[PDB]
Curated annotation (Swiss-Prot), chain A:
One of the primary rRNA binding proteins, it binds very close to the 3' end of the 23S rRNA. The keyword Ribonucleoprotein applies. Signal peptide: none annotated. Belongs to the bacterial ribosomal protein bL9 family. The lineage of its organism: Bacteria, Pseudomonadati, Pseudomonadota, Gammaproteobacteria, Enterobacterales. InterPro entries: Ribosomal_bL9, Ribosomal_bL9/RNase_H1_N, Ribosomal_bL9_bac/chp, Ribosomal_bL9_C, Ribosomal_bL9_C_sf, Ribosomal_bL9_N, Ribosomal_bL9_N_sf. One of its GO terms (molecular function) is large ribosomal subunit rRNA binding. The modification N6-acetyllysine is found at residue 89. This is Large ribosomal subunit protein bL9.
UniProtKB/Swiss-Prot annotation, chain B:
One of the primary rRNA binding proteins, it binds very close to the 3'-end of the 23S rRNA. Forms part of the L1 stalk. It is often not seen in high-resolution crystal structures, but can be seen in cryo_EM and 3D reconstruction models. These indicate that the distal end of the stalk moves by approximately 20 angstroms. This stalk movement is thought to be coupled to movement of deacylated tRNA into and out of the E site, and thus to participate in tRNA translocation. Contacts the P and E site tRNAs. Protein L1 is also a translational repressor protein, it controls the translation of the L11 operon by binding to its mRNA. It comes from Escherichia coli (strain K12). Belongs to the universal ribosomal protein uL1 family. Keywords: Repressor, Ribonucleoprotein, Ribosomal protein, RNA-binding, rRNA-binding, Translation regulation, tRNA-binding. This is Large ribosomal subunit protein uL1. Part of the 50S ribosomal subunit. Cross-links to the P and E site tRNAs. The modification N6-succinyllysine is found at residues 100, 149, 181, 192. GO terms for cellular component: cytoplasm; cytosol; cytosolic large ribosomal subunit. The keyword Repressor applies. SUPFAM superfamilies: Ribosomal protein L1. It comes from the Bacteria. GO terms for molecular function: rRNA binding; structural constituent of ribosome; tRNA binding.
Length: 149, 222
RNA sequence: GAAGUGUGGACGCCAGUCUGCAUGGAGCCGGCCUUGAAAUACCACCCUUUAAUGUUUGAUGUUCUAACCCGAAUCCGGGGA
């Protein structure tokens, strides 16, 4: 039963992964639950059309984002206050969720996934340069100012 | 190694023509003396069956007469008849050891039917070189005295081994492009005419050229 | 497809030739062409050995995640392949 796995494959598989699975089992589970779609000339022409349309419609949100972020370097700093006292250090740390919620309160809609933060760097009170990941190909950075509270 | 640039020579996939085969047979000498180029081919026959075997002679392009060194193997009084005959080398089955040993200095070998089975056992060495005595070749017969005398009349016998392959010296290594191709065509023509009636399918699955050691060259019999 | 000769060089370890070089005597293509201690030519087999590189498959270890498990009314949280 050649079907197109769209859900679970590698995080996502809404591209075109045709695989022969169990017959009857897929028509009772995979399909009803919305996880895969049969691989039939009209359909392949319809779904593969989404691929072209995806790259065709694509960049307005990226081009506008980059230009929007470039404008931030004109507005500057994003002050964030947190408890501190350990000789410059804080008692805690500003995680990704705190950044996304703080940076958004500034005037930009950014998720936590877009906040590239390998390790909690925000531990001291001062000026830091956080890195962001708008896309696997597009990156950026923001200047944050940790204030002593 | 001694094969590094020898491989750049021919194209294992390409099947060169005869003229090109000899022209390409060239490009492949720069060694020592002059290797007697032979012709190896895979016949589509059944080695086991006798009616399938292929043996004969072909008048290729030198080396006949008093010069030819004859080696006779007989038994009993036949030994004396061979001596008085004029055979340079004479002896019984005992001389089969010195041959098995090394001693190869001899152009042709004649023998009697009574010692053919023991000589046949040691035919693996003389077989390919076409030195093994055979009836049709008029090499084996009671009147050995007449055989050796008749010798020096002028044939490059050919036979297919157990593997089903048959080869024979077309001449030497280089040789003017014209001369070799001239002999290759002759050998092929003599082989096709030797194809057994019962043999079905493609007789010559693949023709080529061979002797001692060298790169590879496939050719078209046509 | 310049190298070979006779007296000169190298990247993993040991020798015949080969290439863009440089040159002479050793001869022109050679080297080639019958010495006990110094010896010969063109398409497949067998140990094929050893070494290096690339690809595929299997097993083990480590890390990351959409599974899965638990807490919560929910959001969500903890854990975690």
């Amino acid at each position: 039963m050649q079907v197109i796995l769209l859900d679970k494959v590698a995080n996502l598989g809404s591209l075109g992964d045709q695989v022969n699975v169990k017959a009857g089992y897929a028509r009772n589970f995979l399909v009803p639950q919305g996880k895969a779609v049969p691989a039939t000339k009209k359909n392949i022409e319809f779904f593969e059309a989404r691929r072209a349309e995806l790259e065709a419609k694509l960049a307005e949100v990226l081009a506008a984002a980059n230009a929007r972020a470039e404008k931030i370097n004109a507005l500057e700093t994003v002050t964030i206050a947190s408890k501190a006292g350990d000789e410059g250090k804080l008692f805690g740390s500003i995680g990704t969720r705190d950044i996304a919620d703080a940076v958004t309160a500034a005037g930009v809609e950014v998720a936590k996934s877009e906040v590239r933060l390998p390790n909690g760097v925000l531990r001291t009170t001062g000026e830091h340069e956080v890195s962001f990941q708008v896309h696997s190909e597009v990156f950026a950075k923001v200047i944050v100012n940790v204030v002593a509270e | 190694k001694r094969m590094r640039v020898i491989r750049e020579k021919v194209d294992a996939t390409k099947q060169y023509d005869i003229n090109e085969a000899i022209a390409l047979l060239k490009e492949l000498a720069t060694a020592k003396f002059v290797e007697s180029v032979d012709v190896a081919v895979n016949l589509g026959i059944d080695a086991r069956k006798s009616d399938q075997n292929v043996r004969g002679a072909t008048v290729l392009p030198h080396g006949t007469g008093r010069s030819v060194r004859v080696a006779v193997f007989t038994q009993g009084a036949n030994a004396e008849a061979a001596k008085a005959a004029g055979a340079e080398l004479v002896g019984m089955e005992d001389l089969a050891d010195q041959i098995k040993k090394g001693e190869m200095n001899f152009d042709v070998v004649i023998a009697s039917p009574d010692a053919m089975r023991v000589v046949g056992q040691l035919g693996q060495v003389l077989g390919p070189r076409g030195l093994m005595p055979n009836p049709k070749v008029g090499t084996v017969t009671p009147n050995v005295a007449e055989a050796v005398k008749n010798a020096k009349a002028g044939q490059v016998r050919y036979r297919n081994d157990k593997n089903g392959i048959i080869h024979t010296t077309i001449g030497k290594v280089d040789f003017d492009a014209d001369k070799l191709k001239e002999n290759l065509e002759a050998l092929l023509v003599a082989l096709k005419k030797a194809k057994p009636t019962q043999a079905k399918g493609v007789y010559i699955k693949k023709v080529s050229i061979s002797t001692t050691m060298g790169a590879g060259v496939a050719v078209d019999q046509a």
